[PDB]
Structure formats: structure tokens, C-alpha cells
A paper describes a structure:
Most eukaryotes have two Rad51/RecA recombinases: Rad51, which is expressed constitutively, and Dmc1, which is only expressed in meiosis. Rad51 and Dmc1 are both ATP-dependent DNA-binding proteins and both form extended helical filaments on ssDNA, which are key intermediates in HR. Here, we present cryo-EM structures of S. cerevisiae Rad51 and Dmc1 nucleoprotein filaments in their ADP-bound states.
To solve the cryo-EM structures of S. cerevisiae Rad51 and Dmc1 in the ADP-bound states, we mixed the purified proteins with 96-nucleotide ssDNA oligonucleotide in the presence of 2 mM ADP. Therefore, the interdigitated filaments were computationally deconvolved into single helical filaments, yielding well-defined structures with an overall resolution of 2.7 Å. Previous studies have shown, mutation of H352 within S. cerevisiae Rad51 to alanine, tyrosine, phenylalanine, lysine, or methionine, severely compromises both ATP hydrolysis activity and nucleoprotein filament assembly at physiological pH. Comparison of the ATP-bound and ADP-bound states reveals that S. cerevisiae Rad51 D374 and Dmc1 D311 move away from the neighboring protomer in the ADP-bound states, corresponding to a distance (measured from the alpha carbon) of 2.7 Å in the case of Rad51 and 3.7 Å for Dmc1. For Dmc1, residues F244, R248, and E251 interact with V224 and R187 from the adjacent protomer in the ATP-bound state. Lastly, similar to Rad51, Dmc1 residue R52 from one protomer contacts residue E231 in the L1 DNA-binding loop of the adjacent protomer. As with Rad51, all of these contacts are disrupted in the ADP-bound state of Dmc1.
Residue numbers in the entry:
A (entry chain C): 16 to 263, 281 to 334
B (entry chain D): 16 to 263, 290 to 334
C (entry chain E): 16 to 226, 232 to 263, 286 to 334
D (entry chain F), E (entry chain B): 16 to 235, 237 to 264, 285 to 334
F (entry chain A): 16 to 226, 231 to 263, 286 to 334
């Protein structure tokens, strides 16, 4: 990831960089992504500075027409974060992928928060065993974050548990607007390049709580759009997997279109649970079997 | 617990604070957890002043990304409210957890009211003795409260019956609605911060009789739901444990069944910390205990 | 127990009092225990009107978290009415308990009616010897009520017979609907607050004849109304039953025929006391101990 | 006893009264007793009509809580029908009491039919000597109703025998359903208020024959309905119900009081009060003489 | 395709040619297409210079009235790019046709991106079997372009995956302004004449987010200019512009031919030729197999 | 039709014919129609030459008030170009009229291009069948011309298709200025006199993107004036199509609309002489045909 600071040599004053920081512009990728119209309304930014900023930013990263071979090289750098269950890793083609949006959904009691915790613990695993070796941002919209569970699963994975606990980040989304403010503020944390996973558990809870009654659902939806859009944008810029959790599916066409990958969970026999991929741009629908044990989400044979 | 007093020296007028008091906001955590649109809905509050109130609340304590190590340090303050049964304490990690909602259901004469009384007495116990050394609030819907039982249990644990009987604030939840605003007006009581337990027994007794007939169950549900929602949030910022009793949203769920003779069986259904287990208990002179006890 | 008339002092027109009394609301306690939704169902009352009447009633008597010492004090006024036998009263903690539903059941002629008469006479006794010093409302469904038995037992306890008879308010329930309307009208007569006991003998002798799901729902409504009335009016509602209803009754006792006139009373269920059994007998003095 | 015709002046036309009488309702007490649902089953009656009928009946005779002194005054209207033997009258507290069911049972020849004849002849006696001074409805399920015995006992009680015979309403029940049809047509002739006793001798003779096999024992809830109807008329007409039964849980709970009849030494007979709502168990000695049941010493 | 570099020897210096390159004019056909008023807007270009450039370009290729046999010969140079399913090719009369705008639209998951990848590979096919034997210009507006998918489909089409990927030129459009800047800069790369297809998947993705509120619908004429530029590129460069649209008027006018995609039972998919310049409305069955869009039978 | 070559015997040298031909004048009719001033603006033609040419050419045709005695004979020289639909020709009086500009307009997919293609073939037919037995000039501004469609329609009419394409001269109008150049030097091709139709499809396509309105209509009216005179002295029909000041130039106007289902409506919006009427047409393999046919 390349931030906005390293622009000092290209002819950008510190005042303009600070204005970009205040506007939520923390990296070159979001400099390119943000249009000149949206760049203009940034506080303190003129209608002539945004252009020269744009040509300055265009020089660092080659933004143009390229053969698909270098595009394959680009997509080689996304990480297939393991979801704990090896069969669930295989069915998704490696598991949750960074730079893309993946949603898990189902009834209550189906094992979603446990999937989130398993991702939080395995995301700090290095390459070649399903980890990304990158930090995690957890948004707790349900107040259900249990750090001792993360330490437990870390002991299960034979890693220094205190390190795993310090690496994972955490926020308690007290309301939908607090969650929105948090996802908007992720700029200066994701800019450092240490974070390679955002997990929201759940995504819709505060939206359903704050917005009640049919007279504001559309409002919710469009806010959701922005929220979801930002998440997707945050996925594409900093190369982080966005892992949503939702109850039931619900979210409508808005969430169906926003979510690139979708998984449904349902109960099986005892602690055995069964999952169904429902939508994905790479793989067809199939089935998988998992269990919730002392080390989070694993295979039944584990 | 950080009440709304610390807004005054941060740039908030006394009239604004009193309006917040009328608005149901009595702690810094509560105002930090209230939506701007929700905060301006309070009568006498304009949308311009709620913003400055919000950052005034935000300066005293930060809300956002905090390393999970610090979140674990914060979680370390929670106290396990001992049920009185050492084995049942073990199967729940020391008892009822704070910051969360506990629900108990089963057939009648299964000890749920006895469980409520035992928690109501053990809450006064100091730390490392299964209690938070804090006060109790009892919200009675079935009218089965017996202060004589609290005195008896305080005798059983070698506690002053008058002292434990004194640290219990009691109120009858006559109807479902009255239950709603009796839960709503807990801000004043918990703003002292001494409280560690709130008990409602039973949760569904008032709602089941206030809304009868399949013509309104749906709306009845959401009523109950919003009630539950408040309870859930009412459990978090105040570091209290809410014990809900049910008759046959809740973070913990327990089933109680009648066993052979005078013993009963306890089973766990839902928990965000430990898997389900099984246990046995009796109702001795000190309340719910182990059979050998 | 305070009538809603003090509510008149709070800027409230007499039409409100008449409407509340017509709707079955006869005391500030009933106002506090009645919901806005059901109070609006009363003809002539609007939503804001019900809101203001409720807040005025709450201004009369506060309903909120009080220290439990005050709850013990208000619990001290709870009356323990002797059943006539010292053993059963001891295993009951001092007799029957007000603010609660006591149900006794057993075989045919286990002494349920005789023990109902003993409860009818003992409640008129003052405190310090297991009484309640007040009147008793006797709802009879099988036709087994006998004033002469009450007179004889009252003479046994060495008190005026005719005053004892005039001290009991009796009603015969002909069928289930009459049984319900009687307990509905109990509020008006109990608003005076003199009564202490509500005997129903027996609860479902008319429900069985008049009818299942509708019968069960109607009986559930009946028992709920009885329980609410017992809670609000500081009276013990004592039920008898023959051989669902356990849900409403706070305390349950089973009666078994023994050898000859000897009878066994078993505490099958209680909210407070443990499972204990005892022996009693029906004699010239009513319900007495086996040695007595 | 106030008939339903007393509702005519309260705002009810004769058509509704006739429709009520068609359903077996001849007394305002029966109007109050019958639930609104059962009154809806009456042909030609609507829910509004049922409600207004009930409201009108409530006003003429009040139902509500009253002081128990008034209830003692009401219970003072209960007759004590003489059994014929003074000691058994003392044991029973005055004899056979109306408003309740009295059952007598025992072996054959104990004198159950003779007891029924004695009651049918002594009910006609005035008060203050054990009589109810009213008519008696005899139902014979055995063919043993002997008017000559009634005449003989009436002559024994120095009373006109012809009036005694004319004063008793005799019916012969051929089978069980005929016996029922009799008991729920009894409402018409009981409305006159002249009857104080309903003798059913016996209650089991027709049922033990008309129903045979374990399949029909469950059906004989029909007997429950029969006995409930008898108790209802006993309550709402102030008449004693004197049932007769033989020996070889229904009647145990249906009958308010019970008596065993047993054979003694020689012609002596013993009557044991097995159950009674208010009296304790005792035993009496009696004989069956020319005047029916009589004290053994006399 | 003859680049404007053919004007250097006709009496135009290199500076004017370089300015033409900077002005977006890269072909003599592009010179003839555009009006002199548009050339005079270019910095450093005067009216006389513009006129002499137009005069010189007119001599290279004639623009006048010719017999329709010659125009039939010219129309014989269109490319019939197979869609992937032979049935839909028969419905289209040869599949995709160049010098035209083909717009396929449908709901999410319908298979517009899969068909775009099938097109990226099948255009590279030599002709006589449904191909175009040329490069592809892929513009992605949603991040859904999978090079591995093209690799796998090309392997299904027994081709070298590495060269097949090297031919297609990919561009990720972050926002609408970038998407446009890309489409006008497409003129420089298209001047080689190697390309046969320009995929835009999807056309309206950046517009739904870069413009919000009823105020900016009027500005979202800029999209019309975008589509006009795409149409001009397709007309001048003998390339087929294949658009993708998401469903929930002027856009319909811009596209020469349209296809609508619908989901059927199971994985069966249906394609309807909603609008076509010279074909009737029909229905086709297709599936997304290991080699992209293909017939349901195979 | 007689070209300016026959003027040479009047006393005019061949040294001035080429420059006047470069000025857009190729026939004596164009000489008479044009004014002295417009000949003066032509480079190389002096005022003496301007007056000499016109005075020499004017001794073949007179100018004055005209009773209709002889014009009816000249009026019957007008051809009736069949549209392909008997009903549509009937409401149009037998088909598209020459000596005038016919304009059809409609929204997207109304069949205007198909109508132009059909009219390219029906002209090939002789008279007494709705044709003109002559060439067709197609000016295309949207790129929707298809010689294979002409093939199909000519096959439909039982005609030689290769000859039919041989008799259709095509020209693609890239922009408005090239469109006007095509129109202005179209006279040199029509000087042969064998043409019977001129198709411009569509007339407004180039101007809507090239153009500021004042100059747009200023140029458009000149374009329409030139088209109208071409149609006038060349005995050809100018067929224009429009997508939905033009109405004044076009003598006949037709609206094509999509009706219920696949039915299409051809309303006669405006005609110089015949009343507004109604028709239904279908685009078949033969081009434009009647709904029943
Ligand atoms: N510390 C633990 N060790 C083992 N299992 C646990 C632990 N904590 C929770 N679980 C199990 O994880 C299961 C699913 O939890 P969770 O993911 O929170 O469900 P949800 O899908 O509702 O979020 C629970 O049934 C519980 O038994
Ligand atoms: N990598 C793949 N390999 C095979 N089939 C695929 C692949 N990706 C998607 N599909 C199929 O195509 C469908 C989605 O096609 P896509 O072009 O992404 O739809 P759209 O563009 O209309 O949203 C999937 O449901 C699946 O059937
Ligand atoms: N060869 C053909 N045979 C029959 N109908 C056709 C043929 N070609 C096109 N069409 C019909 O003609 C219509 C196209 O009309 P078009 O000429 O494009 O009008 P416009 O130019 O006003 O858009 C299409 O809807 C199509 O159904
Ligand atoms: Mg969860
Ligand atoms: Mg797509
Ligand atoms: Mg067209």
C-alpha cells in the first residue's frame, strides 16, 4: 500500500496532504478512486489543487490500459484467508479472499461469530497454511467479542496468544452511526499496511435497531449502500478481505448486489453444521461440513 | 460508571444536563451509545446542541479502535455472580456473567425463583466469594418475592440479614408496560454504580396475559423485543448482570427440569463463552446448592 | 386499601370515577395494575385521559424500587389464617397465606368443605391466635355450604354465632358464567377492604358440567382474575378441587382418607415451605389435630 | 317456586316463554342455571333473546353475595322428610332432606320398596311431625309399586287413603330411555310446586338390563347425565330425591347422602348411615310393620 | 485502417500530426468523421491548417457516391464473432458483428461477465469458425475481470492461454471520469488496427455511484457523450463494442443491437434478442460451462 | 432533362462551362432557377458572362402566369414510387411523389430504415407498378444501410438483385459538413437524369451532435433548400427520416409509430393536397408490406 505522504517530492505541500487526511484521503489508491468533483468539496481544497494532485498521483501507480498478464500478476497478491475448515477452504477456492467482499449468513445459533473469531485467529498465520500474516479489524455490532476465546484459539494454533490478541483490533459499534464513523476512520489504520482483514459481526444489527418502521428502510438501504460501498472500496484499496455477518436471506437486492461471495449456514446433527455456498464469481454452489470446537471452526474429523 | 455530571465541566449547561436526565440519559456511556437522531428526539433538545454534547461525551473517554489486549483488561473487571452451586458455577465459569442477559426456563417448582433469591443474596458477597459486593434490584412480575428467604440465605452464608436485606431495591412489575418503564428508569439507580445485578421474574408473565389472541402477537413480539433490547444495553454500560426468568436476544439460556425426589436437573442451551453441559442441583437451606451441600 | 375516591382530589372529574368503577377498577392498586390498552377499552376513556389518570394514581401511591426493608415491613401485614389444626398450620408456616392462591384437593369427602367452613370461621378471629379479624367471601358451586356448621364451630371457638354468620358473604354459583361474573363483581364488595378470605368450593364443578379448549381458556381467565384480586386486596383465595390449575395456585395441599375419621394432609407444593405431611381429623370443633 | 310465566310481565312475549318451556325450562331458577350457550340451542331463540331473558330473570330473583344469615334463612326452607322410624330420623338430623339426593341401598328384602312406600305416604303429612305436606313422584323400574300397600300405611297413619293415592304421581319406566324421558319431562309437573319428593325405585334395575357387556359400561356417561338432571331438579324445585339401588364411583359422588340396609336377627333390620354431608356415621334398628318402617321397640 | 501518419508525405509537418495525436485524431477516417469546428478547438490549430489537413485526408480515401455492389463488398469486411453458443449465433445471424454496439443486459448472476470472458477468448479465434483473430479491449467497472477464467476457457478452446491473455488489454475504471478518460485514450491503442472487440463491463457501474440525487441525472448527457464516443470508435475501427448492463431510454438508442438475459430452471439460462438491426426476436438456451457460454445440449 | 451542353449551340464557348459546373450548375433548369447574383459569386464568371449565360439559356423556356392548359401534361410526368404497401400508397396517392420532399419521422425501431431499403427496390420497377425505372441515391448518416437487405427485397419482388445494387449509389455522410457537400455535388450525378430517388437517413442525426442553435438551423435550412431544389428540377423524390422548421421544407410528412403488439402505424401527418388518413404496415421479407399482405 502507498499512502499520500510520499507525495512530498512530487510537489505537494504539507497543507494539501493534511487537507486530504482530514477529508478521508489516506492513500494514493483513494486519491485515484475519488473523483475531482468529490475532491473539490474537501474542506480547504480549491478547484485547481485537486487536478494537480491527480496528475501528481497518476505518476506513481500506472493507471491505464495493461495486458491481462500483469493483471494476473496483480491478482496474485490477494490472500486466501483460511476459514478454519479445510473443506470450507477448498469449496471457496482457498477461503475468504482479500480485495473482495464475502458474506456469511444464516439463522441464529449457526456458528457465525465463531467463524469471525476463527478468522481473527488464523489471519495472523503466515503464508502456506491459509493465513495472511496481516492484522484484523473487528467491529462488534453485537457486543459479543470474547477476547479470551481468541487467546484460546491462539493456544490451539500454537502461537504466542498475547501477540495474537495485540494484533487483532476491536471496536464496539454502539450504534449504526458509530459503525459508519469507524469504517470511515479505517483510513489511518489500514494505511500502515499491517491490517489485512475487516470482520463485521454483525453488519445489519445496528441498522435494524436504529432504523425501525417501513418509513426509513430506503434510507437505511442507501446508507447501507454507502457503508457497503466504503467497505468494498476499502477492500480494493488496502487489499483486505471484508467478512460480513448477517442474520435471516435478508438485506435485499442491495446486500445481494453488494456481496460478491455469499455463504449460508444451517444446523446439522449435534455440533455438526452444514454450509452452502450460494453465490460466488468463481465457483458453483456446493456443500460443506464443519464443526465448532476448542479451536474454533474446523472439520468434523478434527 | 461515569455519570452525566462530567458533561457540565466539559461545556454543557445545567439545563441541558437536566433535559438529558428527562431524556433517560444518566451516564457518559449512555449518551455515547445514543444515536444523534435518537438523541434529538427528546423534547426540548435541538439538533444543534446534541452534536456538541456528543463530542463533550467523547473527549472524556475514547470510542473506536482499542487493542484487544486493552479490551481484555476491561473484560477482567466483570464479576461472576455465583448461583451458590459450585458445580453450576463451574459449568458457567463462576456463575452468571455481567454485561450480558441470562434467561432461565422450565416447568414450575424448578428453583428459578430460588435461583433469583440466591443471586439476590450472594451479590452482596465480596469478590473471590462469588459476589460483586454490590447492590441488587429485583423486578417482580409474579409476586413471589420473600424477604424472609433473603434473611434466611444471609444466615446461611453468615451475612447480616439486615445488611443484605437493605442492599436490595425492590419493585413489582405489575404489568408489561409498567415493566417497560421500570426497566427504563433504572438509569438513576445504576448511576450510583454500586449495582451488580438486576433480576426480572418472570419476563413473559406480564406480556403473555397483556396481549392475548392471535390478532396482535406479532406486534406484542416487537414490544417484548424492544424491551429485551433495552435490557441488553442496560446490561452493558452499567456492568450489571440481568437475570431473566421464563415460563414454558438472551445471551445465556438455561433449562431446569424436575428430577427424582427433591433434586432437579440443569441444562445449558446458549452461551457465547462455553459449550453446553449438564448438572444437578437441590434447594437446601442456603438456596440452590449441590446435592451433597 | 384505598378507594379511587382519593384520586378525585387530583383534578379528576367524577365521571372518571364512575367509569373506572363500572369497568371493574375500584382501588388505586387496581389502577396501577391495569394497563393503558385495557383501560382505553373502557367506554368513555381516551388515550391521553388514561395516561393522565394513571399518572395521578401513581402520584397517589408510588411504584418503584424501594429498599427491601420497606418490602419486609409491608410484608409483615400479610395475614396467616389458621386452618384449625396446629400441625398443618405449622407445616404451612402459620396457616394459609394471603396475597396467594391456596388450593386443596383430594378424593370425594376428604374434608374440603368442612375445612372450608373452619377457614370461614377462623379468619374472623383476631391476630395473636391465627385469625384475620375480618369477613370472608364464600363461593359455593356444589351446594355444600351449611351456615349451621359455621354456627356450631363458632360456638366451639366461644364467640357470638349470629355475628359470625352475619360476618360471611356467601354466593352460590349456578353455572360457569355465573361463577365468572361473581368473581368479577367481587371487586366492588372488596373495595371496602374488610374481607380476608375468598373460598371457592369447588373451582371446576361447573366447568366440567358446562363443557375443552374454550373451557380451559375460560378457567385460566377465571384463575388469573382470582389471583390478581388476591394480590390486590390483601386476601387469601382458598380453592377446593376434586379428582393446569397448579399454575395459578401458589400453594397446593392434597387430602387423603386415613383410617376411620383420621385424614392426612400432604404439602404437595409450596413457594416457601418444604414438602411436609400432617395428620388431622374432622370433629365437633371442625378441623383439629389427631390427638385433639 | 316461580315459573317462567313470571317473566311475561317483565317484557317477554308468550312466544319466547313457550319456546323456553319446549326446551324443558319451566322455572326462573332453571333459566339462571342454564348457561347462555345451552339456551342458544333452544329452537327459535336468538342470542339477544337469550341475553334479555337472562337479564329479566336476574331481576325477579336476585343472585349475588349475601350475608350468611340470609343463607341460613334460605336453608330454613329445606324440608326434613320422616323416614318412619324415629331413631333413624334422629340419626339423619330430621329424616330425608330436600335440595339433595338421598340414596338407600342393600340386599333384597331389606325393605327399600317398603321404605319408598313409607316416604310416599309420610311426605303428605304436614310439617312439625316429619312430613313435607307435598306431592311425591314415584318412578317404578321394577313393577313393585303397590297402591294397596300405600293405602294400608295411610290407614296406619290415621289419614285418608284415597287422597294419599291421588296425591302421588306414579310412572312406570319400561327401559332406560323411557326412564330418562320421564325424568326430563318431570319439569312440567314439578313446576306446580306441589311435589316435595321424587322416588326412583330403583335407579339401576333398567340400566343393568338395557346395557350389557364391557362396551356399554362406559356409555352407562348417560347415567351421569341422568343423575345430574335429578340433582338439578332437586336443587331447583326444593324436592328430595330418594333413589333406590341394589348391591352385588358414579352414585358415590352423585348422591349427597347414602344408607346401607342390612338384615338383623329374625325380622329385625339395621340401617347404617354410610355417608352424609353433615352427620357422622351411626347405626339404627328398625322393623317393617303394617305402617311401613317403624321403630323396633314399638 | 490507415493512421494519420499517412499525411506526413502529403504536405503536413510532424508538429501538426503530433497535435492531431494529442487531439485524439489518429486515423484518416477519424479526420473525415470529425467537423472542422472540432479541429479548430485543438490548441495550436488554425482554420486554414484544419482545412488543408481535411483536403489532404480526402485524397487518401474517397468519400462519395459509389454503387451498392462496392458497399456490399465493404460490408463483407464485418466480423461475425461467435457468442459461444451456436444457437445464439444463428439467432444473431453470425454472432457479434463489428461496426455496431451490442448491449447485453440482465440481472445479477445472469452471466454477462462470463459471456464477456467467452468473447475475450472467442474473438481471438481465427475466422471461418466464428472468430475475429484480433485483440480485445476490456474495461472493467466492478472488479469482476478474472484472467484465470479466460485462461480456463481458452484451454477449453484449445488455445495457448498465455498469448490469449497477452492479447486482451485490461483497464480497471475506478470512477466515471477515469472510465471516460480511458475510452477517449482508446483511440491511440486502437490505431494499430489489431483489435476487434471492446468490452465494457459494466457500462453504468461507475455512473450509479459517481452521480447521486435527482439533481445529477441531467448531467448523467456526459454518459451520452461517452456512448457516442464508443459508437464512433466501433464505426471507424471495425471493432464490436460489447456493453454490459445491470437491470433492477437513450441508452437503448445508443446500442445498435440488444440481448436480454434471464435465469431459467436450475442452471439453464435464456437469451432473448430483444432488439436487432436486421434480425427478428427469438429465444436461445445457453449455459455457463467450463468453456464459458455454450449450448445446453453440450 | 437537358444539360448545359445543349446550350453550346446558343453561342456559348466551352471555356466557361467547366467553372459554372464547378459552381453547381449542370442543366438549363439550374441556370433558370439560379439568380444573377449567385452566378456572380461563382469565381471566374464575370457579370457580363452571368447575364450572357442566362439570356442565352432563357430562349428555350418561358416565365409568366401559367393557365393549367399544358401543365397537366407536364404534371403527369411525375412518378409514383410505391412504398410497398398498397394501403400506404393509397393514402399517399399511389406512393412517394417526385418533385417534392417526403419526410417520415418516428422513434427508435419504427421501420424508417426498412422503408428506405424497400423504396430503394420499388423504384427499380417500371411504371404501372409503383416504380420509376431508375437509379437511387442513398445518403446514410447512421450507418444502418445494408446491401444484403436490398438483395432480400429485390428477391422478394422477383428482380435481379445484383442489378438492383448496381442501380443504387451509396454515400455515407460522416458529419453535417460532409452531408451538405454530398447534397451540393449530388447535382453532378443527377445530371445524368436517370435517378428517381434520394434517401437521407437520417436528416437530423449529424446536426444533433455537431451543434449554438442559431447557426444549426441556419445551416439546416440551407441544406433543406438545396434538397428541395434538387427534387424540384431533377424530377426525383427526396426521402428523409427523423428520430423523435423541418415541417415547412418537407411537402409530405408521415409519422411511424409502434402500436399494440407487432402492429405499426403509418399516419399521414401532413400532405400538400391529400387529407390525413390511417394505415397499418408490417416489415416482412419483401420489405414494407400490408398487414394482410
Ligand atoms: N470457549 C468455547 N469453547 C468451545 N466452544 C465454544 C466456546 N464458546 C462458544 N462455543 C460454541 O460456539 C457455538 C457457536 O457460537 P457463535 O458463533 O457465537 O454462534 P452465532 O452463530 O449465534 O454467533 C456455540 O454453540 C458454543 O457452544
Ligand atoms: N469461474 C467460473 N467458472 C464457471 N462458471 C462460472 C464462473 N464464475 C461464474 N460462473 C457462472 O456464471 C454465473 C454468474 O455469471 P456472471 O457473468 O458473473 O453474471 P453477471 O455478469 O450477469 O452478474 C454463476 O452463477 C455461475 O453459474
Ligand atoms: N429482414 C427483416 N425482415 C423482417 N423484419 C425486419 C428485418 N430486418 C429488420 N426488421 C424489423 O424492422 C425493425 C427495425 O426498424 P428500423 O428500420 O431499424 O427503423 P429505424 O431505422 O426507425 O430504427 C426491427 O424491429 C425488426 O423487427
Ligand atoms: Mg453471533
Ligand atoms: Mg457482472
Ligand atoms: Mg434507422
Amino acid at each position: 500500500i502507498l499512502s499520500v505522504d510520499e507525495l512530498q517530492n512530487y510537489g505537494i505541500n504539507a497543507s494539501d496532504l493534511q487537507k486530504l487526511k482530514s477529508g478521508g484521503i489516506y492513500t494514493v489508491n483513494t486519491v485515484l478512486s475519488t473523483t475531482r468533483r468529490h475532491l473539490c468539496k474537501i474542506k480547504g481544497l480549491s478547484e485547481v489543487k485537486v487536478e494537480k494532485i491527480k496528475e501528481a498521483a497518476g505518476k506513481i501507480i500506472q493507471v491505464g490500459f495493461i495486458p491481462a498478464t500483469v493483471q494476473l500478476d496483480i491478482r496474485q497478491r490477494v490472500y486466501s484467508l483460511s476459514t478454519g475448515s479445510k473443506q470450507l477452504d477448498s469449496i471457496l477456492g482457498g477461503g475468504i479472499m482479500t480485495m473482495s467482499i464475502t458474506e456469511v449468513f444464516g439463522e441464529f445459533r449457526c456458528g457465525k461469530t465463531q467463524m469471525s473469531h476463527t478468522l481473527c485467529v488464523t489471519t495472523q498465520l503466515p503464508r502456506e497454511m491459509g493465513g495472511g500474516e496481516g492484522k484484523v479489524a473487528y467491529i462488534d455490532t453485537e457486543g459479543t467479542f470474547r477476547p479470551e476465546r481468541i487467546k484460546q484459539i491462539a493456544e490451539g494454533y500454537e502461537l504466542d496468544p498475547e501477540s495474537c490478541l495485540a494484533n487483532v483490533s476491536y471496536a464496539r459499534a454502539l450504534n449504526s452511526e458509530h459503525q459508519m464513523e469507524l469504517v470511515e476512520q479505517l483510513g489511518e489504520e489500514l494505511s500502515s499496511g499491517d491490517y489485512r482483514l475487516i470482520v463485521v459481526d454483525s453488519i445489519m444489527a445496528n441498522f435494524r435497531v436504529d432504523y425501525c418502521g417501513r418509513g426509513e428502510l430506503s434510507e437505511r438501504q442507501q446508507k447501507l449502500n454507502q457503508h457497503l460501498f466504503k467497505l468494498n472500496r476499502l477492500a480494493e484499496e488496502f487489499n483486505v478481505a471484508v467478512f460480513l455477518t448477517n442474520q435471516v436471506p435478508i438485506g435485499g437486492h442491495v446486500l445481494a448486489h453488494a456481496s460478491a461471495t455469499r455463504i449460508l449456514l444451517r444446523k446439522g446433527r449435534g455440533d455438526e453444521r452444514v454450509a452452502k455456498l450460494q453465490d460466488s464469481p468463481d465457483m458453483p454452489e456446493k456443500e460443506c461440513v464443519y464443526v465448532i470446537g476448542e479451536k474454533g471452526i474446523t472439520d468434523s474429523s478434527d
